Design a protein around this ligand. Sequence first.
Ligand SMILES: N=C(NO)c1cccnc1N1CCCCC1
Lengths: 237, 300
Amino acid sequence: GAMNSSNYAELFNNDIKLFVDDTNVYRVTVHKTFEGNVATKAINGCIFTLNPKTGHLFLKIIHTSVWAGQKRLSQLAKWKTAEEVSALVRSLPKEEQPKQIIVTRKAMLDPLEVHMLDFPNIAIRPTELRLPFSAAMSIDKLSDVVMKATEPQMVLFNIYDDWLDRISSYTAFSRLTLLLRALKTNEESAKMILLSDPTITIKSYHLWPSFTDEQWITIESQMRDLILTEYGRKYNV
Amino acid sequence: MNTVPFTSAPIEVTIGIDQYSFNVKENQPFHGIKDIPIGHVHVIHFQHADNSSMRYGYWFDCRMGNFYIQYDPKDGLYKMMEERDGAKFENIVHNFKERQMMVSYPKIDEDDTWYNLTEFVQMDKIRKIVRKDENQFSYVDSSMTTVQENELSDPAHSLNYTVINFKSREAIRPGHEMEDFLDKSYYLNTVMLQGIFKNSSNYFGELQFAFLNAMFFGNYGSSLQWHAMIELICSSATVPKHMLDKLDEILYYQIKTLPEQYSDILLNERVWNICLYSSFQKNSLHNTEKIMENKYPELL
Ligand SMILES: N=C(NO)c1cccnc1N1CCCCC1
């Protein structure tokens, strides 16, 4: 059934699974027209498809041309997401195909189920977890590849960099969720925390800075403080 | 006008004949039903007074044979049997009529209710949904499951309704996923009408039969089928105008006949609110919408 706190260790078992987040597929800026009406302008988006055990991120870039001349774009975006996830599954060797796909929003259930009818043994699941994957476009290298794309494109990343050499996939996912929740709650401050010290750099082949184990503890503490700081500012606590 | 005689009435029972019901007391001198209109299928149905569990009954057409009812004290039900000896049968019936031991089918002359509920229902199609080739009548009860239900034992005790499943490869063309799921016209017109039912008359016959089994026996799988067949039409953007007009009439008479106190169990809120207020056909069922809003506004 649904994925929640009771079954959180299931994410890190040996059954291949993918999270699919569609919150950045259809992105717009809202503006005024010369006549004083309101219109939208689409910008490039992305499907965020993540294996939480390995860190592998299949980032399908959604170029604005896919919306040209279409109607009901927010509905179409869910079906486009499901089409692209289905195409990804079909492109993987059988032994790499997921046994479960967990969607972050329940509106993706029926679109993905219909597109995966050919895969009756792949479970399509919702989650009760509120995962901060919408903040993926606050990772500079990810936002850069999306905004520069001139055509549909898939780019593969490891969202954990090399962390799995030193920590488990449970700890890596917890770090990622903390970083993304911080970037979602206060992007400027989170980026300040991550890049304040000029002596810690981001390797060309990585997404996050090259923190030592002890530096990661400091960073993680600074992110919790940020989340609590903003929570107090929000609720006046 | 035809007759279904009863050998006797040894256990107290409520007997239904189409939309009418009456009570027979234990060992009361009851010998059947006369004046049954020729030209329609009919259903004769039973609920025992001492165990209201198991409503059960028979679909039959008096044009296809001489049928009678006899209680079996072993299997504990009023069993329907065909009499092959015509002159025996006529002689039995004539004697019971002379002794006035039969109820007369109470049809009011103005009243087209039964016609309107069975317009497209034919015995030959009933005999394919309920398979007992040996018998010219069909036996149904409250507990019988459907083929689709058995996907999620004697073959005659399962209802072989046409399986409808909106998230199935039959309903969804590869490459038209969004189109076919949000607009079921392909599945309705090509797969079901052209491919399986052959015409709208057979589709409506099955829909009407499903409703009647839901109403008369409380058969849950029949209720599921009735709503699925409504939803399939209402969720199609392209439906022939004559089919929409006929559906409105069919549903009007079904909603008119439904016992007011069974509406909670026989009507699916989601399907009806979707069909009347959100679907492609939300403005195409004027008679049905009016009776629903005046008779069951709570559901909506
Ligand atoms: N009631 C029947 N014919 O009188 C009948 C016809 C066909 C299939 N089953 C039947 N019955 C037999 C008695 C037990 C319950 C099931």
